[model samples]
Every structure is written in structure tokens, then in C-alpha cells.
Target: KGPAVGIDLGTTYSCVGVFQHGKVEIIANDQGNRTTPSYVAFTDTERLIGDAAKNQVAMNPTNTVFDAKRLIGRRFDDAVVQSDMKHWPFMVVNDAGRPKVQVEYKGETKSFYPEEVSSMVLTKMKEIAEAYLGKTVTNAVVTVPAYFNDSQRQATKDAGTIAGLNVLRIINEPTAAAIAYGLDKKVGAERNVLIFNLGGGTFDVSILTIEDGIFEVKSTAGDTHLGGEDFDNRMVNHFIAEFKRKHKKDISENKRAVRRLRTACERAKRTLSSSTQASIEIDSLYEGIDFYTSITRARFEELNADLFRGTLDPVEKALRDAKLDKSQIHDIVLVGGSTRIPKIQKLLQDFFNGKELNKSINPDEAVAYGAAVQAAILSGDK
Candidate 1:
């Protein structure tokens, strides 16, 4: 059989991995990043994906599509779609009741279904794997959020098909993370695991039991629209108002300026996780005025206090559905980039009564590694 790989097609980023030489290796893109941004852009000259697509978002905000995962397999009239569209710089139009992305490409107007855009990101992952392994790859196991409905799962499978790969399986993100954790830990005894997955665009909490190498999901709950992006938006709005008060000009209507601010706010949010304070600086942000601001970690946490506390609702719901108390949880596994936030971790730790969270596996690559292990098993690789 040809080489098979595992793909984690995420809302903000994507990762690919392969199992070989008795180990799973995450395949980095040509840019040398293990996790590639899930963005697709079209220009007058050609199409772009990943880093290239995200790098020029300020200049091509309308053509750069970054959150196709939110629109996939959804109707234009969907409440989530209607709410999310307001925050996106790109244009989304109703096409026969389905959401279609409208963009100008190659000096012409074009409309693309969400699946097509997701397929482009998948194709990039395929190419990255092929280039690193130096072999053709046509089979893959993709992971999705556990709460995805049937239509969303089917749309994800269609995206893999469009990318020319046979989707061997569509595994749940939490399950994939648990598989990676279980294989790494070599747990032989039955143990309960709670997976807290909060990424850039979605959040999911799942409880599972591992017994005799069999992983069974007990329950799942989460909010698809709650994640890192929401936190960044809170900061963006705060800074926008601050700028307006300082410079006497509102820059929210300027897409380029707003994009620049959002990027800075995201970076600052990441920095605040490790440091007590983070700074945001933009040169010529609007009307040739330089903007500089700083936020303390305490303030950042306060700004998103409600959203951060909201995460525990799903945790409690999952535990209730699983009929397990917090004391019964053997391990709490963290499975997404957003879990790195200090405040979020503190909240989770308190919920578990001071239990140390599991961070043995890389949150960004755990799902992809698990996918690769599954692919290897399916391909008859020892």
C-alpha cells in the first residue's frame, strides 16, 4: 500500500502527520511550520494557501478566507453563519440557501462553496506530506470536532475527496487526542479521561474511558463559536475604542487597520499567557497615526472573564452526561491551542480540585499524530 497520513483540518490551523519507523512524525509545510494556518486566498496572479494566504490578509482581506470550517455544510440562513459573517472581512452570499464565498480572482468574480475552500487547505497538507515523505500519498484519516453534525462530517469527507485523497475515516478530535495520549502512556488499566479542546474557532469537552486498549467516548458538549478568536475580538474592540478616544478617529471601518489590530491583539493574547503584560504597537495604523497600547494579564482576563467562565458549562455538562464526578477523572487532557491560556488552565485546575492537567503531547499535533497512527493501522503497517 502507498503511504497514508493523518490530517487535522482545524478552524484556524491544520496539521499533518505520518507514522513511520515506529513513530509518528508531524510533517511541516514548506515554510517550516508544523501547523499551517487554515487560510485560502486568491489574487490577480494565482491562488495561495496557508502562510502565504494569511500574510497578505490586510491587503486582500476580501479575498482571503480563513474560517471556512464555520461555513461548511451550513445554510446561509443559519444563525451561526449570520452572526459570524458580520465579523469576517470577506464577502459571503446566499447561493440557493447555501453559504458561498464571493471573491475576485484573476481579474474576474468567482464564487466557491465552503467545501472547495477546505479542499484547498487539505490539498496543501497532502502536498506537504508528499514532499516530506518523498512518496505519493492518497489515503488519510481526518479529525473533526466531536459535536459536528452528520452534514458537517460529510462535508469534511467531501473536502478530502476533492483534494484527491480517500478518507479512510473521520475521527472525533477528542478521540484522536485520547488515542495519542493512550498510546504514548501505554495505559493498561481502565482509566477515565476528560479532554478539554479549545482551539481558535471551536471548543469541545469530551469524557472517555480506556480499557484494554479500547477507547469509548462517554459524552461530549461544547460551543462551536467560542474560542481564541472570540477573546481576540474582545481585545480588538477595546483597543479600537481606545484609539478613537486618543486620536479622535474611528478605524473600525478601515478593514486594513482592523486586520492589523486583530493580528496584533492575537499575538498579544498569546504573549499574555506567558508574561504578565503584553504590548501592541502599530505604525501608521490609520491616517498616518501611530498606535501603541499595552494590557496587563489581569486586564485581559477581566475583559474575557465571562467568556472564560462560559467554558466550564460544557465541562460540567459533559461530566453530567457521562455520569461521572470530577473526582473520578483519572486524567484531564488538554487538546487545543487555546488551552495554553493561563486563566483557562487555572479555571480547569480549580474545577478538577487541583488536579494537574495532562500536557504530555503537543496540543497542536496530537490529533494529527493520532490520525497518522490510525492510518498506519488501516494501511497494514506494523
Candidate 2:
């Protein structure tokens, strides 16, 4: 209960980990799951969070915001990344150039800034920590992309305020990955690492050297538009075309169906990683529907080609910014589960000139786990 916690507040999900019993273990929620889906659904009566909120997406996709992390702290007028953002299903209302999600809470439809939306998820994570440990948790470490600007970092701190957490240090996601990478080694030494973080709504490529005394994120670059969310929508639209023909109706008009379709596409996308074929059925999302289709790994790859294309340029840009050539980098460490896409892996492999990716560390939990290590260090336990 005395140990401090570290959190990776993601667009799609959130993970909390703490230094406990002389070792670090990611704290699971009431569901006994390591990650909590970053979704919040509110009404006149009550607020629903995590998986409950996630389930509300197909029902109230307009009000339930899931990926606010993308817009959190970003200017509504940002030239580089704002255009594509405008085309998203979510409508962003601007306040002082900062884009905010539109939400309906307590009977009034309100536009919420990203920091405010994030606070909902943060509140959920904090509730879990407080309820489990029975302690008044305060200061702690949190992780973010290395490429996050000063404004983004500040907004993150704002979210912590709304959730009632004392934000300690905002470490780069790559640096946190390194901590989780070498947790078994007490000395926390230097190891050159590449962090390939492709999350629900953005891609951040960072290079770092984790040394015994010094941990640094050398450089980072990424396309804010590139993420699994885009890939999922692509696949959803691709298959919805067939149903549109058969039913002679457009379910695309239905936001709930569209969001559910995206979730289904993401599931099929993950399932395709292991097998050639994966099928997800939408049960009569309309009254007259008795059909399901399968998406193959190859099909998903084709649909995701452009998505990976957007991802690759950022890799080169990150390396270019780091002034690092292919040979200068020691190891490539994957940090996000979205990197499980075969197309992404193949592109990285080829672009790195056949230098193999370092799969030694996990892609899903490493960032939060490393943040936990940093949490320990900040708490003077390590």
C-alpha cells in the first residue's frame, strides 16, 4: 500500500503498475485484467467506465469518447496533423485552438477537452488503486510518447489534476520500456533500444539508450494519424461494402454499428495474426441480416497497406532526427501490441535492412511496466 504506482494512460486502454513486495507488478482492476479500456459513458443517473463504457460505444458512440489521447493537448489548428483529424467520426470542438470531444453529461451536451476526457479514465484507474490497496495514493510516475510536445505534457498533468493524482515525472514511453526491459537486472544499465509504439490513435517511434546511470530518449518522430484505429476503420469499411450490397441498406449511417464494426475489425485483425482466416459476425445489426464474412491475414494486410505506409515515413523521420543510420542503432524493441501487424513488422524488418527486431521484451505491457520501475526509482525504492 505504501508503494507508488505508474500508469500508461492510453487512448484505447490504461495500465497501472506499482513497485510491490520488492518487485514490480502491474496492478489489475476488479476484472483481474492488466489493462482497462479507456472509455467513459455518463448519464443523468451514473457514470460507466472501462469495459462497461467500452460496451456502450455501439450504443452511444457519439457521447462515449475512447481515444481522446490523440487530441489531448493538441491544437485544433495544427497544420501537420489537423486535416486528417477533421475527417474522423468524432467531432472535435475547439477552445483556444485545442480540440475537444463533444460529450453529454448531466443532461447537457458539452464539448470536453482531451484532458477532461482522460480524467474520466484516470479516475477509474485511481479508484482501482485506492480500493485495492486501501491507501491514499498520491505522487506517481506516468509515461507518454517521447515526441509529445510541452503543451501535450502539460495537458497530461491537467488530466492528473482532474483525477486527483499528484503527477511526479512524465517519462518518455521508450525510456519506460527500457526500465521494464531490464527490471531483472538491479543495476539498471545502458542498452540501446528502439521503441516502436503504435497505439490506437497514434504512432511514436523513439530511440533510447538505457544505461546503468543514464536513461535517455535520443529522438522521436511519428505520424499522429497512423494507428490501429485507422486500420480497423479501413477494414470495417472494406467489408461493410458487401453487406451494403446484400441488404441494400447502409449500416454506415449507424454510428453504433460503425463503431462496433471497427471493434470487430480490430478483433479480426488480431485473430488474423495467428491464422489465415478470422471471422466476426454482426448479428442482424439491421432487421434483415443473416451474414458474416471472414477477413484473412492477407486481406487485412492489403487493407492496411496505406496505414503501414503512413507508419514507415515516421520511422525514417525519427531515425533522421536522431541522426542515426541503420548500423548506429543496437537493437529494435517493440513497445505496443499494434506492432503485431505483420505488414508493420515486415516493413520494419526490410527498412532496417534485415536487422531483426528485438522481441525479447513484450509489446503490450512493457511501457507501463517500465514506468513502474521509474516509479520505484522516484520513490527511492530501487
Candidate 3:
């Protein structure tokens, strides 16, 4: 009757948009934010969403599992989970019907499942879509990481169901990028292309061959646990090391200090994109000892070299699986926020024979935009 809705249920941030008014408009959530914080707090009343939940995480760290979506419906041996286990701050101890993050809130301790953690964000997205459309829209298309297995996909869909959405299908991130690139960015004629998508909490590489409106994914590979969040974590480690070295005390062991480190890491992560080096002032670490560090891009790359090097293996694996040579890849598309890093461009250029990567599409909004395109198709729209 009105229009179709689409969502990109991301690990760190969720986006909702719809195809209407001859264009797709991404709607802001109840918090008046385009992307909802993917954290949940189980309370007697309704679950907390967005800024409130995110802000409360430092003091209530255990329950505010920011990246539990990285482990939803996944076993300990899950590829991503296995890789992430070494670094996760909280324990995945199941408290109730499903596995929740064990956190100390107030004087009490509680846990929350990945499903429920993601549900609070999904519920906010649902409210956004319904309010924007002025109708009770349930059926929708949601996107996910291509490397995600059956259980993870099902877990995501379950979160959608809990949020009252009739999820049509869970599409892959890179595939969605290809569709959006072709339809919106007019890249349908681009032959063999590669999409390097590094989201907040995961990285996906999708090789696509688009011809005559047929965008087929030749192969996809990713380290769903390796992403911007991990990069932030790495930066936080550097911050902690700096704090300890200067203050002669380990500030990272403190929950509040670590939270400040996370926030500083996130800010520095964004700043380093524009500036070759970024600095941070730790107001709370080591009794406000003021941990300060100016990380150059080279130093950042040196610190992140191992992590960055690891991603290329997945790219190589995808290329090998697709039986395509690096020389044959005509266009290289950077598809996520992390690609903003100068090192990413340098590394890909070196690997792809100095090809100028296309970054016309907004990595933060591409998945949602691609989902909206699929929503158009689901509505039988041209």
C-alpha cells in the first residue's frame, strides 16, 4: 500500500530506510539518530537504546556487551568467535534462556544474550520505520555478513522477529554493496570488481562480476571478528601502554579507564583518517594522569600490521575460491568506514597494481542503501 522497508542489522550499528518519494530515505531512530547503538540493557521496564545504553556501558560494562552480535548463536569454535575470544572483555555466560554477557550493574550481576542485545537496537529500528512510514510495516529485507553461517543468520532473523519484523531474506554485505554500486552509483558496466568492506566490528571482501544488470557474487570471505572495533581495541592497547609507561601504573585494568580508552580509540580512529597522526587526553585513566599519545599513521600501521596483514588472507582466499587472478580484477571498491584509513588505500593499491579504488558509496550507509534497493525489488518496483 505505502512502501517497503529495509534494514542493515550491523554488529556495531543498525540502519533503517525505505523506498519512498521516488528515492530511499534513511529514517532516524527514536533517539533521533540515524544509526542506533547496538547495545542492550535489560531492565524491569523496556530495554534501553542508543546513546543512553552506550553511555552507561563503562560503569555497567559486563551487561553492555557492545559486540555480542559478533557471537550471536555461535559456538566457541566459530571462526569469528575463536578469533575474538582472546580479546573480548566480558564472559559469555548464559544466565537465562539464551547466552548473555555477564556484567556487574549496580551491586548486582546479570547477563544478556546476543539476541536480546541486538533486539533492543532492532526494536528501535522497527519504531523508526513504522513511525516514518506512518504504517505498521513488518515485512523487510535485512543484510548480513556473507561469511555468516546458518546459525548466525538465523540468530539475526530471530532478532528481527523479536522486533516484529517479517524478514524476507538475509543478504550478504558485499553483494548488497555491488547492487547499490550498480543501481545507485551507475557501476553496472564495471566488469570484475572487488569490494573491501570493513565495518565497525567485521571485515568482508566480495568479488563480483556485474554485466547487463546481473550482479553475481563470484566469492566472499571475511574475518567477521576483525574490523574497526578491533582496530579501536588495538589503539586502546597502545593508549594503555602509553598510560602505564608514563604514569607507572596500569590504567587499562580499570573498567572506567578502559571505557575511556575505547571512546578515545574511537575518536582517534576517526581523526587519524584525516590527520596522519591523532592525539588523546585520558581524563580518567590513572587518576586523570592524562595519558597522551600522538600516533602517526606509520606507527598506527606498524601496530596494526598484523591485523591488516590477516585481512589479505581472506581476500586471497576469496580470489582463490573464485578462481580469479588479481590482474583480472578491473575495479577495486572500498566499501566500509575503515577504508578511510590511508593504509588501506596504500595496501590495496600495492596489491592491485596501483589501481585507484572507487569510494563513491558511503560505507556507513551502503548496506542500508543496498537493502532499500532490494526492498524496491521485493515491492516489484523497476
Question: Which one wins on lDDT?
Answer: 1
The numbered model that scores best in TM-score is: 1
Q: Each prediction's Cα lDDT score?
A: 0.91, 0.77, 0.75
- lDDT comparison, 1 vs 2, better candidate: 1
Per-candidate TM equals 0.92, 0.87, 0.84
Lowest lDDT sum, 10 consecutive residues, model 1, at 181-190
Candidate 2's C-alpha runs over 4 A off are: 74-102, 109-113, 132-136, 183-191, 210-212
For candidate 1, give the lDDT of residue 306: 99
TM-score of model 3 vs. true structure: 0.84
Evaluated against the true structure, the overall lDDT of model 3 is 0.75
In angstroms, the error of model 3 at 299 is: 3.4
Residue-pair clashes per prediction, in order, are 0, 7, 5
TM-score of 1: 0.92
Model 1 over residues 1-382: C-alpha lDDT tens digits?
A: 6778999999999999999988999998988999999999999999999999998988887899989999998899999999989988899999989999999999999999999999999999999999998888999999988778999999999999999999999998877887786533545577889989998888888888877767788998998778898999999999999999998999989978998999999999989989999999899999889998899999999999999999999999999999999999898889888888989999999988899988777787889988999888888894
Pick the winner on TM-score between candidates 2 and 3: 2
Clashing pairs in 3: 62-103, 63-103, 99-113, 100-112, 100-113
- Runs in model 1 deviating more than 4 A are 76-83, 93-98, 183-189
Candidate 2, residues 11-126, lDDT tens digits: the string is 67788877777777777888887788988877666678898888776766566666677777788887743765656455677677767777677898777788888888888888
lDDT tens digits by residue: candidate 3, 42-119? 343435676677867776554556776777877654555656656766676534434456655454666656776677
